[PDB]
Ligand binder design. Structure first.
Ligand SMILES: CCCCn1c(-c2ccccc2)nc(-c2ccccc2)c1CN(Cc1ccc2c(c1)OCO2)Cc1ccc2c(c1)OCO2
Lengths: 6, 374
């Protein structure tokens, strides 16, 4: 998982 | 190094969460110990909290020194919770702030500028082809710009996302939609320019409003189709310490798919267009220089601006995809993600700026735009 776009 | 010790703590905490062996756990716990130790009735309480922290770190360190990787990691989870209570008891990154500034100016210039451009091209849309082109570009950019205030709000609130999973899926994807839509539209326009220069008879035989509108429709459809796969992989995740909601992408247990997305996005969204459009305008510009340049220069400027403002996003994206999530450079780039995306977002407001500059080089504002985009 990674918040935002990348 | 107030914020920095804490940053080292959370970074190494995630390192322990993604640890390969007991040795890495021990090293990370060592750095955490150093950073925790590096950091009045209030001072005695914060120091008390730090002491409990160091104690738990030492316990976990004993566990790692034994050889129980999993158990040490568990102790580290508990460490995260107590650390959370001690930090919640008592700042935002520079790149996020720059991202806020950029988001703001791009929002103002994009909304007002593209509203004005749409206003201008709307009068002449079915009378002139260029008006169709610029209209579609402006619509893409504007629609993308509508998403900015919510992103701004979320960044201000430390990535917290209270807008739901659907919004999380759709709104952050709009910039990608803007990318593909832009590059496809621009590609069609470039084809038009090429034919205007090298195959004019075709233009006297083919050109009508209909073909332009169909080309735009296909460009939009294809852009949507290129955007949906990433859109479907957007998920929300609730964080419990401190409590908040994160909006992001989820390629968990599928690193190869993440790499695939990064690569495909790089090729179809940047490299192939770079190659083809550079060939195209090499042709056109060499012919021109060996012999409508007002509009052509504007188009060239827009095309160049696309790659200029999309380059850092692509670079950081690919590099990030080829890095381990536990590497320092990866964490750095992760922290830089929003800034790079803002820099990409500059594309959604740069077009009216170019139009205004060329117009100034032609010497009201809408009148000027009318004269420039026709
Ligand atoms: C005039 C834009 C054409 C887009 N394109 C680029 C294009 C070039 C530069 C920038 C953007 C897109 N390279 C190839 C092409 C590739 C192989 C064989 C023949 C043509 C294509 C042909 N594409 C189908 C198509 C047909 C008619 C269309 C359309 C798309 O929109 C408008 O009316 C397929 C395609 C293929 C690769 C793409 C892509 C689209 O977007 C990202 O990368």
């Amino acid at each position: 998982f990674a918040p935002x776009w990348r | 190094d107030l914020e920095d010790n804490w940053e080292t703590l959370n970074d190494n905490l995630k390192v322990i969460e993604k640890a390969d062996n007991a040795a890495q756990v021990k090293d990370a716990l060592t750095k955490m110990r150093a950073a925790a130790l590096d950091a009045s009735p209030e001072m005695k309480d914060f120091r008390h909290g730090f002491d409990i922290l160091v104690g738990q770190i030492d316990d976990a360190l004993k566990l790692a020194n034994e050889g129980k990787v999993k158990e040490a990691q568990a102790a580290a989870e508990q460490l995260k919770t107590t650390r959370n209570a001690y930090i919640q008891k008592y700042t935002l990154r520079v790149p996020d702030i720059l991202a806020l500034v950029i988001f703001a100016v791009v929002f103002l210039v994009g909304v007002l500028g593209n509203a004005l451009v749409v206003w201008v091209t709307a009068f002449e849309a079915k009378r002139t082809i260029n008006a169709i082109w610029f209209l579609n570009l402006a619509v893409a950019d504007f629609l993308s710009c509508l998403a900015l205030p919510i992103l701004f709000t979320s960044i201000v609130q430390h990535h917290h996302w209270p807008f739901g999973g659907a919004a999380c899926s759709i709104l952050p994807s709009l910039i990608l939609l803007n990318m593909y839509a832009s590059i496809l539209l621009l590609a069609t326009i470039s084809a038009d320019r090429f034919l205007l220069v090298f195959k004019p008879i075709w233009c006297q035989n083919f050109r009508g409003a209909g073909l332009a509108w169909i080309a735009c429709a296909v460009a939009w459809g294809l852009a949507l189709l290129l955007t949906i796969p990433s859109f479907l992989y957007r998920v929300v995740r609730e964080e419990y310490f401190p409590p908040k909601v994160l909006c992001g992408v989820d390629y968990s247990h599928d690193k190869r798919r993440e790499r695939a997305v990064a690569i495909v996005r790089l090729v179809l969204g940047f490299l192939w267009p770079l190659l083809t459009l550079t060939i195209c305008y090499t042709f056109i510009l060499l012919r021109t220089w060996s012999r409508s340049t007002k509009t052509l220069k504007v188009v060239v400027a827009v095309v160049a601006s696309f790659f200029i403002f999309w380059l850092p996003y692509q670079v950081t994206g690919i590099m990030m995809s080829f890095l381990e999530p536990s590497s320092p450079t990866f964490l750095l780039l992760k922290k830089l993600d929003s800034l790079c995306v803002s820099f990409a977002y500059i594309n959604c407001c740069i077009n009216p700026i170019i139009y205004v500059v060329a117009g100034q080089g032609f010497q009201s504002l809408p009148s000027l735009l009318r004269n420039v985009l026709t």
